[PDB]
Amino acid sequence: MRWKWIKKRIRRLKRQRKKERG
Amino acid sequence: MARMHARKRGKSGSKRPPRTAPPIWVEYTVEEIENLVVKLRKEGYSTAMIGTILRDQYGIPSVKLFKDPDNPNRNLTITRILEKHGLAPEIPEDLMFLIRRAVNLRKHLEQHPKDLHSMRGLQLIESKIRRLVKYYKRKGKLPKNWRYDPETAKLLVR
Amino acid sequence: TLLDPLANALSHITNSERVGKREVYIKPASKLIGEVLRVMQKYGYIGEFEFIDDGRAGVYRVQLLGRINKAGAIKPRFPVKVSEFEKWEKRFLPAFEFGILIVSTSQGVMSHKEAIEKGIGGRLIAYVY
Amino acid sequence: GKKAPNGEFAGRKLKLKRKKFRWSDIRYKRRVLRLKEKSDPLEGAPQARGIVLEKIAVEAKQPNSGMRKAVRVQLIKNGKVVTAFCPGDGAIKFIDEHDEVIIEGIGGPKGGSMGDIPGIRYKVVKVNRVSLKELVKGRKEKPRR
RNA sequence: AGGUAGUUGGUGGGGUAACGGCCCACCAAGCCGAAGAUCGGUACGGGCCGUGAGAGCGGGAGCCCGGAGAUGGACACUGAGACA
RNA sequence: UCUGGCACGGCUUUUCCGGAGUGUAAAAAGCUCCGGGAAUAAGGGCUGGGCAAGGCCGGUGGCAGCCGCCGCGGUAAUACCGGCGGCCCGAGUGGUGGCCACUAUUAUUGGGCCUAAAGCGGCCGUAGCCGGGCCCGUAAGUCCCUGGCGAAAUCCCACGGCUCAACCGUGGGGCUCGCUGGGGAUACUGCGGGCCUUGGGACCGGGAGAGGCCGGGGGUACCCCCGGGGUAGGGGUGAAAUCCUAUAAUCCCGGGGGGACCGCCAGUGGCGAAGGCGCCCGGCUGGAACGGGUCCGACGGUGAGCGCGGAAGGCCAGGGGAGCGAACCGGAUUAGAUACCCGGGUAGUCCUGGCUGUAAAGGAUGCGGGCUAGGUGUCGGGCGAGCUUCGAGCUCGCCCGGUGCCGUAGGGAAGCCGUUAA
RNA sequence: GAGCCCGGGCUCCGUGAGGGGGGAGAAGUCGUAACAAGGUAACCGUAGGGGAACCUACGGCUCGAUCACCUCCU
RNA sequence: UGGAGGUGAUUUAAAUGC
């Protein structure tokens, strides 16, 4: 679980933060 | 009884004599006592150790009980015997010993700086000084214009 | 440190009570406690006490009859009007009978019942019942 | 010390504590801001008339299936799209498209649609300023336009 | 979370029914703020009112009491009194 | 059909009609008096559990619907629809919405926080709150009394008025109640002054330890490289392969070089605030225990803000790199394997300086003081003895500080906790 | 000395292609992740990688595993 | 009689069900 979520949250964050940074 | 300060460890239970007036099987005059004190402060010993040697040699456990009454404003004891003569350090010994030590630390750290623990007691001794300063100001052994710092600790010792 | 030395007296005295020892020793001692035990004895709750004043401290050795149920100090020690007494009457005490809500007063120190008979009040100090 | 400062002059700390900790009641927070009043259209109101855009029927929930009668109505000043649950058996009949339909809530404003219905926040009372429970009984009045 | 430039104060003066940076000339650099100022939201305020064993919580409706307004916004006369 | 109902017999007669004044200072309100005069407006909700306060028949068949929740309708439904019966309340009764209560679910009264939500990873001290004893001054808080005052209304109580009450009148009380003036008390609290050692701090001497830093120094094993000796493998697995070795591996002997680390010791052990800490020796240095309170004389606690220390991983710059090893490259496994298993392998792991600041950073248990059966083991310090190798070396007991386990009273929902408190 | 206007800046209301997630519907598909040692214990912070559940490294923790082997404790 | 560590560990036993 919290492994999952942390990396899902991180990937969401990055990918989206990539989309914001871009 | 205890206070585990910067520790978890219960303090020593050392306890006073419950004597309230002094032994008479021990015998000294107000004049004789006063001499003994002045001689020892002349050596370079300090008031705790002055009270220590008098205890171990001359058999007087605390001065207050023996002396007062001889001017019953308050109890007459070592440094109050000293101040009337002018032998008293204007800095209280409490605050002095403290600062004294402190300046020695700094020199170690000077040469050795990779020291957690030694760094961490610098922080632990200053902050006792600070306090000891703070209240004295208000009581009045140290002027209100003062403030504590590590250059104003290296000036008081020298 | 300590504060509320009284309270740390009282609280012993009660936890003392609840065990059913014979007599108590309270290492810190005072007027507050002295006086309060005095008033306490006056109502009768306790037997006899001696304090010995050591050059250290007063100590009270107290004799326990069995009477006391619960007797406690007040936390911020509120001021209480003589009109508000009845409120503080219903709350703290167990019923109309008992009446040692010990307050401190202009006249001195009293219980609740000794306060009411005079007619005077103030800040609360402790309770006993 | 069980939390709180107790002390004569401290009270202010008390006074701010409560308030700080009050805002963990969703309901309280919400009203004191007025989120109840801003979000779930109405502008807060008891009821709202609106023009029946169309009639739609939706499915029931998890252990359930049955065709609930729901309207789509547009509140007129609110100007907001509301899908809605219609009381009664036959009903969907007595409601013509483009009659006025007054609308209310149903079963706590919290958002809670009743157990069966997914969405429906709201209720219908009226068709052309005469209600639905009056149109389930044949005698009482019968509809127009 | 820092705000403040008639801005805080001083001297002298104007204007006003009258005190007052109200206004103004000169001089000073204060004044306010984490005991929460400033800014933003919301809101007439009080007597009361609803509820609750109490403590409390919510509320400003008739009515009474005080203030504000009169299509939005500014402006004077006339009168003891209005910026009506 | 005995809760009640119906026939029938008798009684009285709310509305409704007509009259008298009223009132109007004109009506209406048509009240109020009198004549006439009828048993003549009752409904809405619910009835499965909750709430029960109230159950059958017929239809219908997880449909149509009911529904505030928990559910109920899938072919004998008391829950739906209709009827029939019954319960509630009654000119009301019910639906939606809002507020308060219930909700000690906002904790003052009157909540928690080991494992249910929730202790900050730990410390420091600023602002704040909170403070040992003993004497004297003031009387600021505080209590007492008087006095100025907080409009009327509403509320509560009495009496009186209207047929009754609502409502009003008179008299008594309370009222946000946040203000003020004067007198009085001095326990408490504030403030001021004085005085004292129980808290704190401080000193001297004995003492243990993986506390820190620095310098010094030895050995193990792994690897590597060189010489010799020695041949047909070895490596690897459940089987295997890739891979090691034929200019010779593994293996053994001798020689050399490199980096990491310090089994047993080692303990239910010690030290540290915490992260954490372990070859030996010396220098520098932090803390700590105890005996004696020998000195200071309340100097205290806690601590928002604030400041500081903080495993591993990561990052930065420089230096280093044996073994190990994310990523990565092969083999196997397997239905497939982005794996478990095996053979290589970079970053990193080490050193120096800096940054970063996270955790099941646990004892899931903030800190300080006081109080509340005990037992036992253990570490260090003290003490009275016996033993002695004459050293507290081996033991008994009381005491002090710490570190475990068991358990009385109590607490807890229970597990458990229980003088190292929960 | 108002309203009024003009040029720019800042903010807010009505409304818009497109875009994010939630509580769901549970008859398609992939896998077996966890819950039994879940068939490689599990979680945990950090880092990389994989379609996914997830795997691996390093450090921690037991809310950790089942005998066995060794060590202590009323 | 009941509790805490240190390390062997065992692959011969295969995904899913409204």
Tell me the three-class secondary structure of D57-74, residue by residue: EECCCCCCCCCEEEEEEE
CA dist., res. C33 & res. D1, Å (int):
22
Kindly compute the dihedral angle of the four CA atoms of residues D33, D38, D43, D45, in this order, to the nearest 10 degrees: -60
Indicate the DSSP class of residue C104.
Answer: E
Domain boundaries, chain D: 1-145
Breaks (C-N over 2.5 A) in chain D follow: none
Residue D143 and residue D123: Cα distance in Å, rounded?
19
For B21, which residue in chain C has the nearest alpha carbon? C55
Gap between the Cα atoms of D33 and C65, Å rounded: 61
CB of B59 closer than 8 Å to CB of B50: no
Chains D and B make contact, 3+ CB pairs within 8 Å: no
Residue located via tokens 């004789």: B32
Q: Return the beta strands (E) in C37-93 as ranges.
A: 49-53, 58-63, 79-80
Cβ contact C88:C124 at 8 Å:
yes
C-alpha distances (whole Å) from C117 to each of C84, C112, C120, D83 are 16, 9, 9, 74
C23 touches strand F (CB under 7 A): no
Distance of CA D6 to the CA centre of its chain: 45
Which residues, 6+ apart, have CB-to-CB distance to B67 below 8 Å? B30, B33, B75, B76, B77, B81
CB contact under 8 A, C56 and B16: yes
Mutation for testing the D interface, residue in C75, C80, C124 having most D CBs under 10 Å: C75
Q: How was this structure determined?
A: cryo-EM
Chains that touch A (3 or more CB pairs under 8 A): none
Residue B14, helix vs strand vs coil: coil
- For strand G, which nucleotides have at least one atom less than 7 Å from a protein CB? 14-15, 21, 23-26, 43-46, 49-50, 53-56
